[PDB]
Amino acid sequence: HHLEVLFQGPHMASLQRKGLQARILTSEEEEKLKRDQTLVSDFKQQKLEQEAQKNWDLFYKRNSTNFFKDRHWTTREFEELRSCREFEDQKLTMLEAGCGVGNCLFPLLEEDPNIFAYACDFSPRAIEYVKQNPLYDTERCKVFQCDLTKDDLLDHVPPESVDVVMLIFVLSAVHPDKMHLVLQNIYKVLKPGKSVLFRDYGLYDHAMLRFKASSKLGENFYVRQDGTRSYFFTDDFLAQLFMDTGYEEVVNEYVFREVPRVFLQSKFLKPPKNP
Ligand SMILES: Nc1ncnc2c1ncn2[C@@H]1O[C@H](CSCC[C@H](N)C(=O)O)[C@@H](O)[C@H]1O
């Protein structure tokens, strides 16, 4: 059960945008949310940015937590991985950028036994989780520490060697002013003609509506109780980031999932090389 729709035309698109917003968001509760979510202090916002890696690492050090997520994958990403593969067992090279404990990595590794995955995260405890997974295998997976906003992926990944990059619930954790750095870093490992598969929180997702006072860092940008952060993307903001860093939009769609979750799921192409 799914229904996919594309609205074209200035008037048609705007009318639908506002209709869907009003069906999730009470239109007067919009003003209420903006007044109630008062802004975190500059001092604390600086600390949260400086401690981005530390707060994720502390999250992964928790006990009493099932970090693993069944059904976290999607049919859409699996189909994208079957595209342009002549043989089911053909070698395919991927990067799972911001891999966490591997909830996207390991399901993808069971798709094609000659998938080779680079995988990186800035949390050392996440990387240890990856390396201790039952499915971990150095002939299938090269995992390494990398802060995507400032460590060059080329230190570990040969240039233009990757057939697909996954960027799944990662970019929303990055400061909006630094998101472009992440995509520029990724650009250099991706083969011309190949894509980033993106999925992340979207505007007016349930989580955004639940955040309270002194959780708001900025428009669409919140800190969670564990100090990690979530930005809630609009389609246009996300497309502009990718266009500004050299990609072409293929797919860029809101996903409504029923509790009304709002995600953005997208596919952005690195252009074929020219003359
Ligand atoms: N600047 C950065 N560089 C590298 N990893 C980052 C990062 N900012 C956030 N992360 C990582 O992004 C992850 C988000 S959780 C999503 C993990 C995985 N892609 C999945 O789909 O399950 C966390 O593991 C966090 O440590």
Question: Beta strands 92-97 and 162-168: pairing type?
Answer: parallel
Domain that holds residue 40: 28-269
Instruction: Report residue 5 CA to chain centroid gap.
Output: 22
- The residue whose C-alpha atom lies closest to atom 24 belonging to ligand 1 is 100
Q: Which long-range contacts (CB under 8 A, 24 or more apart) does 2-7 make?
A: 4/253
Q: Is residue 254 part of a domain?
A: yes
The residue among 208, 216, 207 whose CA lies nearest residue 38 is 216
Question: What is the four-CA torsion angle of 179, 184, 188, 194, rounded to 10 degrees?
Answer: 70
**From ligand 1's centre to the CA of 270, what distance in Å?**
22
**144: Cβ contacts below 8 Å, ≥ 6 apart:** 118, 119, 120, 127, 156
- Partner residues linked to 195 by β-bridges: 164, 269
DSSP secondary structure letters along the chain: --------SHHHHHHHHHHHHHHHS-HHHHHHHHHHSPBPPHHHHHHHHHTHHHHHHHHHT-SS-----TT-S-HHHHHHHHTT-SSTT--EEEEEET-TTSTTHHHHHTT-TTEEEEEEES-HHHHHHHHTSTT--TTTEEEEE--TTTS-GGGTS-TT-EEEEEEES-GGGS-TTTHHHHHHHHHTTEEEEEEEEEEEEBTT-HHHHH--TT-EEETTEEE-TTS-EEE-B-HHHHHHHHHHTT-EEEEEEEEEE---EEEEEEEEEPPPP--
**Both tokens assigned to 195:** 């894509």
Q: Is residue 117 part of a domain?
A: yes
Q: Is residue 18 part of a domain?
A: no
Q: Is residue 20 part of a domain?
A: no
* Experimental technique: X-ray
Q: From 56, 165, 175, give the residue whose CB has the most ligand 1 atoms within 8 Å, as the site to mutate.
A: 56
**From ligand 1's centre to the CA of 79, what distance in Å?**
23
Question: What is the four-CA torsion angle of 145, 52, 253, 78, rounded to 10 degrees?
Answer: 30
Structural domains of the chain, count = 1
- Rounded to 5°, the CA angle 53-57-61 comes to 170
Question: Beta strands 229-231 and 221-223: pairing type?
Answer: antiparallel
Q: How far apart are CA 179 and CA 157, in angstroms?
A: 20
Instruction: Report residue 209 CA to chain centroid gap.
Output: 20
Q: Is residue 197 part of a domain?
A: yes
**Both tokens assigned to 93:** 């090279």
Question: Residue 39, Cβ neighbours under 10 Å: how many?
Answer: 14
Place of tokens 């564990």: 226
Q: Which residues line ligand 1 (CB under 6 A)?
A: 52, 56, 72, 98-100, 103-104, 121-123, 126, 146-149, 168-170, 173-174
Q: Is residue 7 part of a domain?
A: no
Q: Is residue 100 part of a domain?
A: yes
Q: Is residue 264 part of a domain?
A: yes
CATH of the domain at 196: 3.40.50.150
Interior/surface letters 95-104, b for 16+ CB within 10 angstroms, e for the rest: bbbbbbbbbb
**168: Cβ contacts below 8 Å, ≥ 6 apart:** 96, 98, 104, 197, 198, 199, 200
- The residue whose C-alpha atom lies closest to atom 14 belonging to ligand 1 is 170
